[PDB]
Design an enzyme around this catalytic site. Structure first.
Site, mmCIF file in Angstrom:
data_model
loop_
_atom_site.group_PDB
_atom_site.id
_atom_site.type_symbol
_atom_site.label_atom_id
_atom_site.label_comp_id
_atom_site.label_asym_id
_atom_site.label_seq_id
_atom_site.Cartn_x
_atom_site.Cartn_y
_atom_site.Cartn_z
ATOM 1 N N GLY A 44 25.204 49.723 28.251
ATOM 2 C CA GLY A 44 24.351 49.596 27.058
ATOM 3 C C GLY A 44 23.434 48.387 27.121
ATOM 4 C CD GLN A 49 22.210 43.065 25.083
ATOM 5 O OE1 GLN A 49 22.290 44.244 24.755
ATOM 6 N NE2 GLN A 49 22.923 42.504 26.056
ATOM 7 C CB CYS A 90 28.199 41.529 26.015
ATOM 8 S SG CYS A 90 26.535 41.440 25.331
ATOM 9 C CG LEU A 91 24.662 44.000 30.649
ATOM 10 C CD1 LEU A 91 23.490 44.935 30.947
ATOM 11 C CD2 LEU A 91 25.515 43.745 31.885
ATOM 12 C CG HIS A 132 28.674 45.878 22.110
ATOM 13 N ND1 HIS A 132 29.592 44.916 22.444
ATOM 14 C CD2 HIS A 132 27.499 45.492 22.657
ATOM 15 C CE1 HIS A 132 28.995 43.983 23.168
ATOM 16 N NE2 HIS A 132 27.721 44.319 23.317
ATOM 17 C CD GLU A 133 24.492 47.620 23.380
ATOM 18 O OE1 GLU A 133 23.494 46.908 23.138
ATOM 19 O OE2 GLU A 133 25.312 47.398 24.319
ATOM 20 C CG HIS A 136 23.413 43.122 21.104
ATOM 21 N ND1 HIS A 136 23.561 41.765 21.364
ATOM 22 C CD2 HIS A 136 24.159 43.781 22.020
ATOM 23 C CE1 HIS A 136 24.373 41.617 22.396
ATOM 24 N NE2 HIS A 136 24.757 42.854 22.811
#
Ligand SMILES: O=C(O)C[C@@H](Cc1ccccc1)[C@H](O)SCc1ccccc1
Ligand SMILES: [Zn+2]
Length: 171
Positions: A44, A49, A90-91, A132-133, A136
């Site tokens: 994702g 991000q 998480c990236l 999660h996304e 963000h």
């Protein structure tokens, strides 16, 4: 490849604006987001991000990296009080993973890259990843659900990983 913001970068706390029209510029951004995400590799990425503060999420939950999904202007509604533990990464918090408990079933309403609205019901990894996304887009990181020591230790280890990634570019 777009550069991915790293915790504790304050631009990761920005609240994303809705996408007004699905232009060819948000289509190219989506394309650049997929390449960045697949190359990391990750499952994702939120536009937040890559420092583009708009309600755009790309995702691909498949081993084959050939089930791509786009969510624009998403609304996520939990359909149960039941949560499900999942070891999240998480990236934007590179090489850190910890357990987070989120509602186990959700409704997702969003628009696709054609500007078409859709409504789907999500469980398992989709429910975990969309929430999660969505976080963000509301300036929230999965480390905000951990104890402050766990957050401090994450911060200190990410700063080390980022410094090593810079040194790898000089070598
Ligand atoms: O950078 C992000 O926001 C995406 C995360 C999403 C994620 C959600 C739930 C649980 C783990 C991760 C990245 O996909 S994490 C990298 C990764 C790569 C391969 C397999 C699993 C995780
Ligand atoms: Zn993330």
């Amino acid at each position: 490849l777009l550069p991915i913001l790293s915790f504790p970068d304050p631009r990761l706390r920005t609240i994303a604006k809705p996408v007004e029209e699905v232009t060819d510029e948000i289509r190219q951004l989506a394309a650049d987001m997929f390449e960045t995400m697949y190359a990391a590799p990750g499952i994702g990425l939120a536009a937040s991000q890559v420092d583009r503060h708009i309600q755009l999420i790309v995702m691909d939950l498949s081993e084959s990296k050939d089930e791509p999904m786009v969510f624009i202007n998403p609304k996520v509604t939990p359909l149960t009080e039941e949560t499900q533990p999942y070891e999240e990464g998480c990236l934007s918090v590179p090489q850190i993973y910890d357990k987070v408990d989120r509602p186990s079933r959700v409704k997702i309403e969003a628009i696709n890259l054609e500007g078409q609205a859709f409504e789907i019901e999500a469980d398992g990894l989709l429910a975990v990843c969309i929430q999660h996304e969505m976080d963000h887009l509301n300036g929230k990181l999965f480390v905000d659900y951990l104890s402050p020591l766990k957050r401090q230790r994450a911060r200190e280890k990410v700063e080390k990983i980022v410094r090593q990634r810079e040194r790898e570019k000089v070598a």
